[PDB]
Design a protein around this ligand. Structure first.
Ligand SMILES: CCCCCCCC(=O)OC[C@H](COP(=O)(O)O[C@@H]1[C@@H](O)[C@@H](O)[C@@H](OP(=O)(O)O)[C@@H](OP(=O)(O)O)[C@H]1O)OC(=O)CCCCCCC
Ligand SMILES: CCCCCCCC(=O)OC[C@H](COP(=O)(O)O[C@@H]1[C@@H](O)[C@@H](O)[C@@H](OP(=O)(O)O)[C@@H](OP(=O)(O)O)[C@H]1O)OC(=O)CCCCCCC
Ligand SMILES: CCCCCCCC(=O)OC[C@H](COP(=O)(O)O[C@@H]1[C@@H](O)[C@@H](O)[C@@H](OP(=O)(O)O)[C@@H](OP(=O)(O)O)[C@H]1O)OC(=O)CCCCCCC
Ligand SMILES: [Cl-]
Ligand SMILES: [Cl-]
Ligand SMILES: [Cl-]
Ligand SMILES: [Mg+2]
Ligand SMILES: [Mg+2]
Ligand SMILES: [Mg+2]
Lengths: 310, 310, 310
C-alpha cells in the first residue's frame, strides 16, 4: 500500500465549569464563526463538585454537558460521538464528522487520579487515544493542583499522569501504550499554573494595558517548561487573550470575594507531533456560567491516509 | 382571583430505626385511631448504617421502609406519593390524598450533610418543599450530632442546614429559596438533644414519677431555644410522653448495656407559620423494632385556596 | 423419616488474582484430570484493586471471573450456580451439579470487612452457608492482613470475621447463625501467614531442596494454630507443594523486584466437621496470570440424606 498526508481540522476545547450545569448555548465556544471541524476534542474540569461524584458515583452532569456540547457543534456536519471518558469532574469527549467515522480505530480511554492521597479524582487526567486512518493520536485532559505555591505538585501531577496512563493494545507482547507513543498528542486542561512574583494589582494593570507579553514572562507554565520539569517537546501558541480565571460568576469582572484571587492563565492547550499548525488559540468571554472562561484552539493536522488502488 | 383559608390535616412523623429493616405494621404509628390525614410527612433516621450507604450507594432499606409506610397510611384514603428524598440514613416522604394531588406544585427536594468532616451524610438534613394551593410549605428532617456534651455541634448542624439548604425556583433572578422563605415550616428529626445536669437515676425516677415538666426544665433543646442559639421563631408542643431513647431493642426497657445511656427526648417536631394548631404530639411505645420509639404530631393548618368563579 | 450418610465430592479453590482480568483457561485449576465434583466452592482475593471497587462500586471483574470459572468447571456435568458473594476483591462462588440443585436450601451469604479502620473491604471475609439435604455447610473465603510482622492482626481479622459474620435464619427467636453453628465448615483464602525466623535465601534453598516439612516448622499459621490463637478445631492437610507467593507475573520465578519478597504459603484451605476426608491439596503452577498460584483441595464429605419411603 501507499500513504500520503491529508490535512484535517481538529478543534480542542477546555472548560472548567465550577460544578455548574450548562445554562448557555455552547456555540459561542464550539462553533463561533469557524469552519466545521473534522474532529472535536472537548474537555471539562469540575463537572461535578459533589461528595457523591468524588466517591465515583454516576452524575447527571455527564449527560447534561454531553448534550450541550453535541448541540453546540458546528451545524454543517453530522458528528458521530466516538468516545466519552470521565473521572469525577474531568471529562473528555471525542467526536468526528460522520463521513470520517469509518476511519477511526483502536479507541482506548483511561484515567489517572492525582488528587487526595495521590490517587483520588478531584485532580488528575483522562485520555482518549485512537487511530485516524494510519496516524495515532492521543488527547489528554488534566486538572492539576491548585494555588500559586503548588507548582511543584502540578509538575508531579503531570509526571504521574505520564507514567501511570497506560492504554490497551492489540498485541499483548509489546509494552503497553503510553501517552508519549503517539504521532500526535494534544494536551488540554485547567493546568492551574499562575503568575509568579507580581502582586494582584500589577497583574490586573498589565491585563488592562493588554501587555500579555510582559505578564507571560511571569507565567509558571512558561518558566517550568523552560526548566524542562514539564511538557518536554510540547509547544504552546502565543497567549493573545486575557487570563481565563478568576471571574465573578455571571460576569466579566475579576473575583470580588474576600479572597480576591489574582488572575491566571489556568486553562491551556499544548501539542506535540509532526505536521501540526495552530490556526487559532482563544478564550470565549461571552460564556459566564463559570468562574473560568472556556479556551479553544483549532489545528490543521496532517494525517497519513491510504491511497486508493484502481 | 380571590383566596380564602381552608384547613387541612397534616401528619408529621419521625423515627430513628437503628439501621433495621421494618418488622412491624406501621399503623400503630401512622394511623392509630386518628382521622385520615390530608397530608403525610414521614421522616426517618439511621435507615442504613452500612459503610456502603455511608459512601452514598443505593440501599434496599429505602424501598423496604417506603412500602412499610405506604401500607401503614390511613386506610380510608388513597394516598399519592409526592416525593422521596434520602441522604444516607436520613429519609423524608411526602404523600397527599389523591383528591388533593392536583393542587401540589413546585416540588423540590435537597439535602445537606453535616457529619464526618462537616460534609458527610452520617448526620445532616433533608427537606422537601412544595406549594399546596397558594401556600408554600417546607418540611425538614434532620439528624443532629450525638452525645450530651455536643450541644454546640448540634446548634452548628442546625445553622449549617439552614444556611446551605437551597431550593430551585421558577425564576432565576431572585435569590434561591431557603428553608425560612416558606409560609409553613415543619421541622422534625432525631435532634439528639439530651438532659443536662441530672444523673441517670434521677432522670429515670422523674420519668417513673411522670414528672415531665421537671425533666423538661433540664432539656437541652429547651435551654438552647431560650438562649436563641437554635430554632428562633419555632414552637414545640408540650412533651407529655416519656423520652423516646434509649431502649433495649424488642422491649420498653431502658438500655441495659454497659453504656447504660440516660433517657432523652431525642426525637422532636417543631413548627413555624400562621394558621397552625397542633392537635396532638405523642410517641408510640408499641413499636419495638428500634432503640428509639417513633414520634408523631397532627396539625390543622390553614391553607390559601383559590375560590371558584362562576 | 430416616437419614443415612451419602458421600459427595466437594472442590474448594482459592486464588489471589492480583487485580487482573482472567487471561488463561481455568481448567488447569478447576478440572485438571479430576473426577467431576458434586459441589464447587471457588474463592478469589484481589479481584479488583481500584479505588472505585474499594468504595463499593460494581466491577466488570465480577462477571469476567465468574464466566472464566463457569467455563473451567468439569465438562461432564452441568453445574447450577447457587450463589455469588463479593466484598470489594473477595469473591466466593458456589455451584452444584444440576441433579443435586433441588436438595440445596437455606442459602445465605454475608461479608465482614476487616481492612482500613477495621471495617473497609480491602481485607476481610465473605461466606456462603446452605443446607445440602439434611446437612448444614458454611464456606468462608478470607483475605487477612499482609506482611510477616502482622500475624497478630491476621489473628484479629480471623476473630473479627468469626464474631461479626451473622446469617439470617428461618426462625426469629433463636440467636442468629454464626460460622461455627454448621455441620461442615470449609475455610479458604489468602490467609497471608508467612515464614518466621528464616532469611529469604534459606527459605528459597529449602524449597529448592523440596524440604517442605522443615520449612513448615517455621510457618506462622502452624505456630498460631498450635498456640490456639486461631482456627481452633480446624484441620489443614500436609503441604506438599511449594509456596504460592510471590512470583513474577507471567512466570514461575520468585519476585525479582527490589522488594525481593520471601516466599510464603499465603494460600490455604482448612476444614472442620464429621465425615470429611481430604483427597488432595495442591497448587497449580501452570497459571501465571497472577503473582500467586491458585490452590485447590478435593474432599469426600458425608452428607445426611433422607431415605425414600415406598
Ligand atoms: C481517601 C478518601 C477520603 C478523603 C476525604 C477528603 C475530602 C477532601 O478534603 O477533599 C478536598 C477537595 C479539595 O479540593 P481541590 O481538589 O484541592 O480543589 C480546589 C481547587 O481547585 C481550588 O479551586 C481551591 O479553591 P479557590 O481557589 O479558593 O476557589 C481549593 O479550595 P481551598 O483553598 O478551600 O482548599 C480547592 O477546593 O475537595 C473536593 O474534592 C470536593 C468534594 C469532596 C469532599 C467531600 C468529602 C468530605
Ligand atoms: C471523609 C470520608 C472518610 C471518613 C471515614 C470515617 C468513618 C467513620 O468513622 O464514621 C463514624 C460514624 C460515627 O457515627 P455518628 O454519626 O457520630 O453516630 C453515632 C451516634 O448517632 C450515637 O448513636 C453514638 O452511639 P451510641 O450513643 O453509643 O449508641 C455514636 O457511637 P460512638 O459513641 O461509638 O461514637 C455514633 O456511632 O459512623 C458511621 O457513619 C457508620 C458508617 C460509616 C463507617 C464505615 C467507614 C469506616
Ligand atoms: C475510611 C475510608 C478512607 C480510607 C482511605 C485509605 C486508602 C488506603 O490507604 O488503602 C490502602 C490499601 C492498602 O492495601 P492492603 O489492604 O494493606 O494490601 C496490600 C497487601 O495485600 C500487600 O500485598 C502489600 O503489598 P506487597 O506485599 O508490597 O505486594 C501492601 O502494600 P504496601 O507494602 O505498599 O502497604 C498492600 O498494598 O490499598 C487499597 O485497598 C487499594 C485501593 C484503595 C486506595 C484508593 C484510596 C486512596
Ligand atoms: Cl466569546
Ligand atoms: Cl403505641
Ligand atoms: Cl498446574
Ligand atoms: Mg470551582
Ligand atoms: Mg443506632
Ligand atoms: Mg497484589
Amino acid at each position: 500500500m501507499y500513504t500520503y498526508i491529508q490535512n484535517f481540522r481538529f478543534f480542542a476545547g477546555t472548560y472548567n465549569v465550577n460544578g455548574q450545569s450548562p445554562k448557555e448555548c455552547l456555540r459561542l465556544w464550539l462553533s463561533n464563526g469557524i469552519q466545521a471541524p473534522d474532529v472535536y476534542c472537548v474537555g471539562f474540569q469540575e463537572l461535578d463538585l459533589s461528595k457523591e461524584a468524588f466517591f465515583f458515583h454516576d452524575t447527571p452532569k455527564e449527560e447534561e454537558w454531553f448534550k450541550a456540547v453535541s448541540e453546540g457543534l458546528h451545524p454543517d456536519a453530522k458528528y458521530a460521538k466516538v468516545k466519552l471518558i470521565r473521572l469525577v469532574g474531568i471529562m473528555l469527549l471525542l467526536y468526528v464528522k460522520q463521513e470520517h467515522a469509518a476511519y477511526i480505530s483502536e479507541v482506548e480511554a483511561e484515567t489517572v487520579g492525582t488528587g487526595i492521597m495521590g490517587r483520588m479524582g478531584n485532580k488528575g487526567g483522562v485520555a482518549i487515544r485512537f487511530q485516524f486512518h494510519n496516524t495515532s493520536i492521543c488527547v489528554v485532559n488534566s486538572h492539576l493542583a491548585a494555588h500559586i505555591e503548588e507548582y511543584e505538585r502540578r509538575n508531579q501531577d503531570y509526571k504521574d499522569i505520564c507514567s501511570r496512563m497506560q492504554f490497551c493494545q492489540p498485541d499483548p507482547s509489546l509494552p503497553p501504550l503510553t501517552i508519549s507513543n503517539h504521532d500526535v498528542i494534544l494536551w488540554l486542561g485547567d493546568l492551574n499554573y499562575r503568575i509568579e512574583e507580581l502582586d494582584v494589582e500589577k497583574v490586573k494593570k498589565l491585563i488592562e494595558e493588554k501587555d500579555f507579553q510582559m505578564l507571560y514572562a511571569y507565567d509558571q507554565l512558561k518558566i517550568q517548561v523552560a526548566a524542562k520539569t514539564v511538557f518536554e517537546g510540547f509547544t504552546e501558541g502565543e497567549l493573545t487573550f486575557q487570563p481565563t480565571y478568576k471571574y465573578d460568576t455571571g460576569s466579566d469582572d475579576w473575583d470580588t470575594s474576600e479572597k480576591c484571587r489574582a488572575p491566571a492563565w489556568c486553562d491551556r492547550i499544548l501539542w506535540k507531533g509532526k505536521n501540526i499548525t495552530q490556526l487559532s488559540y482563544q478564550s470565549h468571554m461571552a460564556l459566564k456560567t463559570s468562574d473560568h472562561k472556556p479556551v479553544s484552539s483549532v489545528f490543521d493536522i496532517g494525517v497519513r491516509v491510504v491511497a486508493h488502488h484502481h
